Structure formats: structure tokens, C-alpha cells
Design a protein around this ligand. Structure first.
Ligand SMILES: *[C@](O)(C(=O)NC1CC1)[C@H](CCC)NC(=O)[C@@H]1[C@H]2CCC[C@H]2CN1C(=O)[C@@H](NC(=O)[C@@H](NC(=O)c1cnccn1)C1CCCCC1)C(C)(C)C
Ligand SMILES: *[C@](O)(C(=O)NC1CC1)[C@H](CCC)NC(=O)[C@@H]1[C@H]2CCC[C@H]2CN1C(=O)[C@@H](NC(=O)[C@@H](NC(=O)c1cnccn1)C1CCCCC1)C(C)(C)C
Lengths: 304, 304
């Protein structure tokens, strides 16, 4: 028992990380098969960032302008293309350590593991959620661009995130592995507001189930509610509306604990209206929303 | 910027995990060179656990009583010895994926990465601290025994923890890789109280420095204090005494932020005496004590 913010084992990803240098800009790429993927702003000067025309900037580059370095050994770049906001650099060697993998776009409130990297060297792994406003609250320094987010779905690495930039609030934005930003962001140095951040209600309910499973029961009450009346209270505390699809995906946790989703919803209503009165749940003073129903099931049944 | 509970990349450890079976008991071992390390209670029946004589139980076992399984391929056990509470099983193959490694005993309040495993398959990585009472608040299910804790110190894996058992409070206990329990525990199914848990004061100060570095400054005040008067207030809130060695090891964070350790100590005194008044620090409502000074320096300077 116990409950931790747990990331996926990062070995399958650590063997795909490389250093990509173009001019004096060095960041990280993802070397799958015979393609190195990286943020396209690797081609930009600090002046270019103000208002880049990436097509004009990329046309001025040749294959030899890119240093791709897998550990010590230099890869030969034999071709470069642009897909949305990512560069795909063709190289002369397929990565032996290439695992089985898919590219996947995740939805607001899904979680993933970030392998934070500097100079193609993996430095750290942590778990986070795609916020409803499509930012992530990561930990990224200068040089972290091209670090990736992933899930491991039964020995298949699902890549969902490549790091591009940090907003002035200290939150993070980037793309899927086909180069489309999560959220309304563009890879240019202008003011770009993230939406209002909301609490991921389905995730909070998942974590309250995790608490019950671990014997933290004090917040259970005799009350019940409708989905409508819950969503009325939710919306007032800047919680995401809860949908029937959410209720469905909570079904398995409901079944295992024998607490109906709408009964648990009644516990959360009272917590929101009344606070925790100096109590904690799984040692937290705040309601946690970075665990999906599937994370709680995985960690509390123990899939490998 | 941003601040996350970050674990070490687990690839170097994932390549050392094996399944160890003896009778109907299956758990995890650590396969370094030509030795598989595992909890010695792998040899016990449920009846043996009440009061085992591990020497008598081990003498009744032969090399062929142990199934060591590296992924699919069965290792041949060619010799078995007992070191304190760990078994060392000699096998017929040295692990190619053996990284550079040391065995290290950590001190109360040091942090490490746990690779949680089931059936020799790595399932998850998280960061935690050795509590002052020598328990860890892990996430471990049935089958997790033999999962290991480690640090990566510049491509050298320092193994510090092997998982043995869970106390009724849902906290965890186990050994260093030479088989000595952390804390007063023994591998027997009897009542064994953990000490009083205290807050790791040096770690809280490290994290308050992390908050300043990330622009959370509201808790800084004009007051200062002596180490003595701080420790008087600390002891009352069940915080570990702060020592000059702690003040020294905080020096680098002090230098970078230009806030003397004893000035930061004055901020923490006021937080403890007055609470946070519904405010948060790095998004937490509670003071965080599972980051060492070295973790904050690593993550806020970005070593790989
Ligand atoms: C990454 O490229 C990297 O690791 N490079 C290696 C070191 C050489 C680097 C990593 C930081 C975590 N990212 C960037 O350099 C990105 C790119 C993409 C946009 C242009 C540059 C800037 N950038 C940033 O992350 C910056 N943030 C911003 O420029 C934001 N600026 C503003 O909010 C803004 C701008 N003008 C006026 C007013 N406000 C925006 C916000 C969201 C839209 C794009 C970026 C810094 C300042 C480096 C954090
Ligand atoms: C581990 O061996 C494993 O993964 N085995 C694979 C599935 C086959 C397993 C993992 C659980 C996280 N650990 C154990 O089986 C250990 C060993 C070591 C001590 C004997 C057994 C029991 N055990 C436990 O973790 C248990 N906990 C306890 O028995 C504790 N009991 C009490 O607190 C107690 C006992 N008698 C009376 C009153 N209270 C003690 C507490 C600290 C000293 C040693 C264990 C369970 C019940 C399995 C959690």
C-alpha cells in the first residue's frame, strides 16, 4: 500500500535521446529508427524568435549545418524536413535501441512521464498532467527543449509530448511528436495567455478512490448528489465539468471500493464547500488532480 | 524553472532486475556481475515468518531450489550465501547490462529513487526520503519485495535500499545491499514500532530555497534567529534539530540566493508559529521535506 506520484521506467526512452546542435543552439532530439525529431526553433537566432519565417530559415540550412551526437558518436544528417513545429532529421544509422513505439496526442487531464534531458543526457524523470489549459507544470531549465513525455503501454512507448518553451508564470508548453502545439501557443517570442487553469475533477475523484483503497475514509459521507448539482458546485470552484464518460471511466474504482461515483461526488462537494478543516488525505492538505483513474488502477493493482 | 519530485533515470537499474522464486514465493532480485541479491525471507513459509531461524532454513535449501529468471532466460544458480538479511545467489552468467555501481548506506533524511518491480519487471519510478525513524513512505504491493532504491552519481549507480516489508501504518522498511535493516526492524512477523517520525528540517530549508529560486518569496521576513532559538521552536513542532553540518550543506543555496541560512530559519520559525494563512509555497499547503540541499542544487542547476 501507499500512494506516490509514480513515473514510467525511462530506460526505453533514455536510449533514444541525442544532442542536436545548429549554429550555437544545442538541445535534445528523439532518435527513433532513421529520424531525429527536435523543436524547429533549433534553427533560430535570438532575433529570429521575435517573428520567425521557419520555411525561409529552414531553406537557408543544409544537412551538414546539424550536429546530431548519440552519446560520443556523431550521426551523419542525410536529410531534413519540417512537420508543423518539429524538425525531422534523417540520419545514416537506425537506432538499435529504438523500442516499439507510437505517437499519440493526449487529452486535457491525461498524465505522462517526462524524461528531462540536457545535451542529450537524461537527468531526471517525473510524472505530470496535461492541464485543462494545455500547459504542463514541469521542471525545465535552459537546454531542456526536446525533452519528451511518454507513457509505456505494455512494452509499447506512446510518445505524447516534446518540450518547446516556458511561459512567464513558470508553466510549460510544447507539441505532440507530429509538431502540433498543445493549446493556443506558437513557437515565437510574443505574449500568449494560457487559458484559465481548472482542477481536473475526474482525477480528484480517482485520487479520493486511491485514498479509500489506502484506508483514508474520513471524508466519506451519507449524502449523494446528481451529476448536474455536482457540476453546479464544481464550476463555482473552477473544477472541470464531470461528464458521463468520466463517470464511466471511474466505474472500475467504484466497483472495487463499492462506492458509487455520485456518492464519491457528494464527498468532494462537501470538501469543496467546507474545506478539509486542517485534515489531510494521503498526507495532502490540497486535493490532488494529477492521477487519472487508470493511474490509480495501475498503481493499486500493480501492472508492470 | 518549476520544481518537481524528480527521480533518477532508471535504465541502468531496469537492466539488473530479475525474478527470484523459491518454493511458491516469487519476488525481485538485483543481478550485478555474477550475484543475484534478494530478501532472505524468500526461503520462508507463512508459518516460518512467525519466528524463522534463517540459518536452519537456508541449510535445508540447495542451489536448484532457486529459480532466477532474467526476462525469459533462466539463470543457473551455482551457489547461495546469506549476508545479514539478504541472500546472495551466485549464477553461471555475469550480467552484461551490469553498470558501474557501489553499495552505500544512506542517512536519515537523504533521498533516493525507488524502481518498484513485480516479477522482475520494472513497473514505476518515484523519489522518496529515508524518514528520521528509518521507514520510507513508498508505494509497494504484494510482490514488490527486492525492489531497490538508488542514486546515480555521475554514471555510478549507488544502491542504498532493498524493500523487505510494510508496517501496519502503511510505511515501508528494508535493508542496505549488505542486508542491514534501516531502523530497529527484523524480518519476522511480530509487532515492531517505528520511532516517532520527525520533519527533516534541513530538507524543508532546502525547499524554501527552491521556492525563492522559483520566485515564491512571500514567506521571507526581516527577522533573523540563532541556531539554538530555532532548534527550541523546531523541537516543539517535531522538526529534527538543525546542526552546523546542516547549515554548512545549505551554504551553496544560501550563496546563490544571498539569504543566510539563519535568515531562512527565521522565515521557517514564523511559518511554524503562524501557519501559512491559506497561502501555498511551490503550490504546496504543507512544508515539503523530501528534497535534500543537493537535490535542489541538482534540479535548479541541472546536472545530467
Ligand atoms: C529551449 O529552446 C532550449 O532549451 N534551448 C536550448 C538552450 C538552447 C528553451 C527552453 C526554456 C525552458 N525554449 C525557448 O527558448 C523558447 C522559444 C520558443 C518561443 C521563442 C523562444 C522563447 N522560449 C521560451 O521558453 C521563453 N519564453 C518566452 O519567450 C515566452 N514569452 C512571453 O511570455 C512574452 C514574450 N514577449 C512579450 C511578453 N511575454 C513565450 C510565452 C508563450 C509563447 C512562446 C514563449 C523563455 C524566456 C526563454 C522562458
Ligand atoms: C514481500 O516479501 C513480497 O513482495 N513477497 C512476495 C509476494 C510474495 C512482502 C511485500 C509486502 C509489501 N513482504 C513481506 O511478506 C514481509 C515479511 C517480513 C516480515 C515477515 C513478512 C511480513 N511482511 C510484511 O510486509 C507484512 N507486515 C508485517 O507482518 C508487519 N506486522 C506487524 O506489524 C505485526 C505483526 N504481528 C503482530 C502485530 N503486528 C511487521 C512490522 C514490522 C516488522 C516486520 C513486519 C504484511 C502484513 C504482508 C504487510
Amino acid at each position: 500500500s501507499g500512494f506516490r506520484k509514480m513515473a514510467f521506467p525511462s530506460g526505453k526512452v533514455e536510449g533514444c535521446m541525442v544532442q542536436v546542435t545548429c549554429g550555437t543552439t544545442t538541445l535534445n532530439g528523439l532518435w527513433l529508427d532513421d529520424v531525429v525529431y527536435c523543436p524547429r526553433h533549433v534553427i533560430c537566432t535570438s532575433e529570429d524568435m521575435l517573428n520567425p519565417n521557419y520555411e525561409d530559415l529552414l531553406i537557408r540550412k543544409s544537412n551538414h549545418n546539424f550536429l546530431v551526437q548519440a552519446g560520443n558518436v556523431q550521426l551523419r544528417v542525410i536529410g531534413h524536413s519540417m512537420q508543423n513545429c518539429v524538425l525531422k532529421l534523417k540520419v545514416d544509422t537506425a537506432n538499435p535501441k529504438t523500442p516499439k513505439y507510437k505517437f499519440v496526442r493526449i487529452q486535457p487531464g491525461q498524465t505522462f512521464s517526462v524524461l528531462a534531458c540536457y545535451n542529450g543526457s537524461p537527468s531526471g524523470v517525473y510524472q505530470c498532467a496535461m492541464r485543462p489549459n494545455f500547459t504542463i507544470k514541469g521542471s525545465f531549465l535552459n537546454g531542456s527543449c526536446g525533452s519528451v513525455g511518454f507513457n509505456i503501454d505494455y512494452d509499447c512507448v506512446s510518445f505524447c509530448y516534446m518540450h518547446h518553451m516556458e511561459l512567464p508564470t513558470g508553466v510549460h508548453a510544447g507539441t505532440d511528436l507530429e509538431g502540433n502545439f498543445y493549446g493556443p501557443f506558437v513557437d515565437r517570442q510574443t505574449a500568449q495567455a494560457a487559458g484559465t487553469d481548472t482542477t481536473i475533477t475526474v482525477n480528484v475523484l480517482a485520487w479520493l478512490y486511491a485514498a479509500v483503497i489506502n484506508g483514508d475514509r474520513w471524508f466519506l459521507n451519507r449524502f449523494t448528489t446528481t451529476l448536474n448539482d455536482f457540476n453546479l458546485v464544481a464550476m463555482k470552484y473552477n473544477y472541470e465539468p464531470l461528464t458521463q464518460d468520466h463517470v464511466d471511466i471511474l466505474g472500475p474504482l467504484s466497483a472495487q471500493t463499492g462506492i458509487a461515483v455520485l456518492d464519491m461526488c457528494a464527498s468532494l462537494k462537501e470538501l469543496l464547500q467546507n474545506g478539509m478543516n486542517g485534515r489531510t488525505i494521503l498526507g495532502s492538505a490540497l486535493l490532488e488532480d494529477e492521477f487519472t483513474p487508470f493511474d490509480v488502477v495501475r498503481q493499486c493493482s500493480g501492472v508492470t
